[PDB]
């Protein structure tokens, strides 16, 4: 029904203003609260604050005083604003409105944005280390795992496809692990041993921030 | 600051299994509010005001509790029930989350399918070398993943991480990655990577030898 979205960076520096703006449509803001909760990494929840229909705003004690939230009742949409953020500041942001019911039916419902991911750090653009992984031997089983590794790079995030998305069923992308300020991540594909090396195949790895177009066909070593 | 304690923090229960899940509140609420988070999706509202189903909700769940002493129940535990639950409580400002139950599929355990890589010739370019072992598809999540140049545990300089249960066979995987620098893994031969698990006590382990292949 209503549809609530998530606008703004991706990425700040510390000591910076965080900057989002949530628009509202499917209903008005003259009505009701709405609000910005974020999702730490751990996933805990923190409720950060509203702003209600008269423009009126509650601010979660624990951001202190960095914390503001504004609105564009012409325009259908709330911002929030929060000053100096530290890297523990990095969670993804979603503007959403409290429980309630509404027109007519019988059951209470809520509305959530996508969410955004935000990350502080004072990194910089850091294209990835493409790396094939193929096994140093092999005799038996049906099975070869194979897979690549995406190393140093900045910031998230990263895609990985096998042979332009014709390999998934055995495929495994794992999480991002930020290692002395770089990410790193690695994948891993599963084919039967009659298919490679007899027959081809590739790691597609492409990184948003830094315009990189990696393949890389897995060949013996 | 009204305190959310929620328990269990994790668990795995069988189709068809009856789930609890509990939020203890620092102070009286006169609700509690659950939440339900799939891995893709935002929040959404699962129960109201304690006890009320709230839309798109299915009948086999349901809420009680008054006071300081909140739950959240499955009669049946179906696939799709399968997420992270938060309980809330907004009747004292600020309204506070509980740290949340996160929900999986229990199936049957399978045995970590190993797999090692040595270092890149492309990664000896530079001043490092990673060691990559990949541990997919087992049951249950809690794995040890060992490390052994020579023989010999080596611990730190590792990187590793997990997948989430798998959406089609409800498994697990996780990667582990050693990077040495190129001097120090050119001084070593043997490289192993050990998985102790739960199919059987000492286990799964893959090696190779720098001294092989090229």
């Known amino acids: 029904e209503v549809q609530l979205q998530e606008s703004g960076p991706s990425l700040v520096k510390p000591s910076q203003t965080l900057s989002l703006t949530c628009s509202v449509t499917?209903?008005?803001?003259?009505?009701?609260?709405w609000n910005w909760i974020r999702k730490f990494p751990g996933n805990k929840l923190e409720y950060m604050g509203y702003?209600?229909?008269?423009?009126?705003?509650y601010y979660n004690p624990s951001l202190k005083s960095r914390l503001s939230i504004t609105r564009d009742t012409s325009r259908n949409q709330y911002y929030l604003q929060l000053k100096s953020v530290t890297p523990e500041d990095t969670a993804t942001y979603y503007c959403?409105?409290?429980?309630?019911?509404?027109?007519?039916?019988?059951?209470?419902?809520?509305?959530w944005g996508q969410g955004t991911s935000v990350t502080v750090s004072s990194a910089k653009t850091t294209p990835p280390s493409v790396y094939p992984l193929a096994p140093g031997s092999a005799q038996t089983n049906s099975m070869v795992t194979l897979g690549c590794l995406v190393k140093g790079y900045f910031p998230e995030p990263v895609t990985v496809t096998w042979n332009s998305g014709s390999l998934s069923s055995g495929v495994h992308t794992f999480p991002a692990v930020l290692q002395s300020d770089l990410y790193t991540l690695s994948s891993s594909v599963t084919v039967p041993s009659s298919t490679w090396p007899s027959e081809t195949v590739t790691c597609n790895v492409a990184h948003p921030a830094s315009s990189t177009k990696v393949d890389k066909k897995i060949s013996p070593g | 600051d009204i305190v959310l304690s929620q328990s269990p923090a994790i668990m795995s229960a069988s189709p068809g299994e009856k789930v609890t899940i509990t939020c203890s509140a620092s102070?009286?609420?006169?609700?509690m509010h659950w939440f339900q988070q799939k891995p893709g999706t935002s929040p959404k509202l699962c129960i109201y005001?304690?006890?009320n189903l709230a839309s798109g909700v299915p009948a086999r769940f349901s809420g009680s509790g008054s006071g300081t002493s909140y739950s959240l129940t499955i009669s049946r535990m179906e696939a799709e029930d399968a997420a992270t639950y938060y309980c809330?409580?907004?009747?004292?400002?600020?309204?506070?989350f509980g740290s949340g139950t996160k929900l999986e599929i229990k199936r049957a355990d399978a045995a970590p399918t190993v797999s090692i890589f040595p270092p890149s010739s492309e990664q000896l370019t530079s001043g490092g070398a990673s060691v990559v072992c990949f541990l997919n598809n087992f049951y249950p999540r809690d794995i040890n993943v060992k490390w052994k140049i020579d023989g010999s545990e080596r611990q730190n300089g590792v990187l590793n991480s997990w997948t989430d249960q798998d959406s089609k066979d409800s498994t697990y995987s996780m990667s582990s990655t050693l990077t040495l620098t190129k001097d120090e893994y050119e001084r070593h031969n043997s490289y192993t990577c050990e998985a102790t698990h739960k199919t059987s006590t000492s286990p799964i382990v893959k090696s190779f030898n720098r001294n092989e292949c090229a």
């Open positions: 959403a409105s409290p429980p309630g019911y509404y027109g007519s039916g019988p059951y209470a419902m809520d509305y």
């Open positions: 499917g209903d008005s803001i003259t009505s009701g609260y």
């Open positions: 702003i209600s229909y008269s423009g009126s705003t």
């Open positions: 102070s009286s609420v006169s609700y």
């Open positions: 005001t304690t006890s």
């Open positions: 809330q409580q907004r009747s004292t400002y600020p309204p506070t």
